[PDB]
């Protein structure tokens, strides 16, 4: 029944309707994660995280138990993480990090001391 009329942080709305924004964003990340090459580690590890956080969103409908169970702060903080992570997947698709190393370093570049 409660709606946390004020969120803890400033600049964040109250987001009166959770469990729908989270399901939409986590589902979107999986679809974009499906366009990655299969061997790329980002596809493997990010699926294992989004799916884990997708089950928990469907598991408990109460928000107060979701924030505690889903250890990511308040629901709003968790949602802004899905958006940012969703942005990362798009940027990952273009940078193509999974390719092998380019231009291994010169002879001594991490030799400390001198």
């Amino acid at each position: 029944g409660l709606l946390k009329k004020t969120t803890g942080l400033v600049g964040l709305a109250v987001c009166d309707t959770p469990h729908e924004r989270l399901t939409i964003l986590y589902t979107k990340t999986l679809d974009i994660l499906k366009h990655f090459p299969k061997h790329a580690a980002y596809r493997k590890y990010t699926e294992q995280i989004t799916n884990e956080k997708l089950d928990m969103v469907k598991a408990e409908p109460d928000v107060k138990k979701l924030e505690a169970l889903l250890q990511g702060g308040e629901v709003e903080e968790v949602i802004l993480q899905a958006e940012k992570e969703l942005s990362l997947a798009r940027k990952m698709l273009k940078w193509k990090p999974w390719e092998p190393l380019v231009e291994e370093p010169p002879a001594n570049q991490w030799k400390w001391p001198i």
């Binding site: 400033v10 600049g11 964040l12 802004l80 001391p113």
Partner: protein, 360 residues
């Protein structure tokens, strides 16, 4: 009288401390840190002391840690007193600045009694503490502490519920929580927005893990909420002093490791090895193993961090100083949007800025 663009041209106090350190031994460079944030004096050299301790892989004795926490809280009261007052001096309330400087003078006697200088006590060496507390100085600290919470209330009466102060401070310098991290803010600026962060309660470095206290958090991001965070931190720091006074374990003040800390004057003048170590520690200086560290402590301004690189020598290789004010002042452009010239004046103080640390 509306500011469309701020371009803080720091550099008027760029002494260039980081380069002068590289030619100085570790003990020689200690007073440089008392002069970076020159209103929280001995809470700077704690950052240096912790960094050198980490590389040297030594830890200070139990008594030294409590002195470093007890005096690390008097710096917090000293620095917050100025922040509350010099902030109010620019706004116009001159009277509180004169009241609370009758308390800074009292506390500067403690530095002048543990060290010999009112302000720049080169007292917290890496190997613990330089010299033990004189007899009865704890009694003077206690007699100060009792009267203090009355002093903070007297200021709290003057400029906490006034129309003039609330209107000059509320709704000003609102910084969103998302932007506070992206702009690299730290300290009270983070806590004013609402973000829960304090290195004394998340990355403890001293006996701070055995001492109880509360971290004030603000609802809105305005200069008013972070004013209350500064005033409320004085209350909580004044609560740590009660605990440090009530448990100050007996023991030594510097690590019993004559290769890093100097030996006593008495042993220097009767034993040979002690004289050799006294002779070498003050000519070449102890050698720290090669390595790099970034240690951060909750200085009153915020996250004061030092990045020491080292090689197998007695003088460091690179000593970058993360002054908390560098990020805050860089963000001054965003704070003052659609705010008048007087508001900018009220936003310089609310960041609690000294340009010794920024320019360094």
């Amino acid at each position: 009288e509306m500011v469309r663009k701020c371009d803080p041209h720091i550099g008027l106090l760029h002494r260039g401390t980081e380069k002068l350190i590289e030619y100085k031994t570790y003990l020689q460079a200690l007073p440089y840190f008392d002069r970076l944030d020159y209103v929280s004096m001995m809470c700077n050299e704690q950052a240096y002391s912790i960094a050198v301790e980490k590389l040297l892989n030594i830890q200070p004795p139990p008594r030294a840690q409590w002195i470093r926490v007890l005096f690390g809280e008097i710096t917090r009261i000293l620095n917050h007193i100025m922040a509350v007052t010099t902030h109010a001096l620019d706004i116009g309330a001159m009277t509180p600045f004169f009241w609370m400087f009758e308390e800074r003078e009292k506390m500067f006697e403690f530095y002048e009694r543990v060290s010999g200088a009112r302000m720049h006590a080169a007292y917290i060496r890496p190997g613990g503490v330089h010299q033990d507390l004189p007899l009865g100085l704890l009694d003077d600290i206690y007699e100060f502490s009792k009267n203090f919470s009355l002093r903070i209330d007297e200021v709290e009466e003057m400029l906490t519920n006034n129309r003039i102060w609330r209107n000059r401070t509320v709704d000003i310098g609102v910084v969103t929580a998302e932007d506070a991290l992206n702009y690299g803010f730290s300290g009270v600026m983070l806590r004013g927005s609402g973000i829960q962060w304090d290195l004394r309660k998340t990355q403890p470095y001293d006996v701070y893990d055995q001492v109880e206290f509360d971290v004030p958090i603000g609802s809105r991001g305005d200069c008013y909420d972070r004013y209350l965070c500064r005033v409320e931190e004085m209350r909580q720091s004044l609560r740590i002093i009660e605990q440090c006074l009530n448990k100050m374990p007996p023991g030594e003040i510097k690590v019993d490791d004559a290769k890093v800390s100097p030996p006593k004057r008495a042993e220097m003048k009767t034993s040979m090895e002690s004289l050799i170590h006294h002779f070498k520690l003050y000519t070449e200086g102890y050698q720290v193993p090669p390595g790099a560290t970034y240690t951060a402590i909750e200085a009153p301004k915020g996250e004061f961090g030092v990045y020491l690189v080292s090689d197998g020598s007695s003088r460091p290789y690179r000593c970058k100083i993360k002054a908390p004010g560098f990020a805050h002042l860089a963000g001054l452009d965003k704070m003052s949007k659609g705010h008048m010239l007087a508001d900018v004046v009220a936003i310089i103080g609310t960041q609690d800025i000294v340009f010794g640390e920024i320019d360094r």
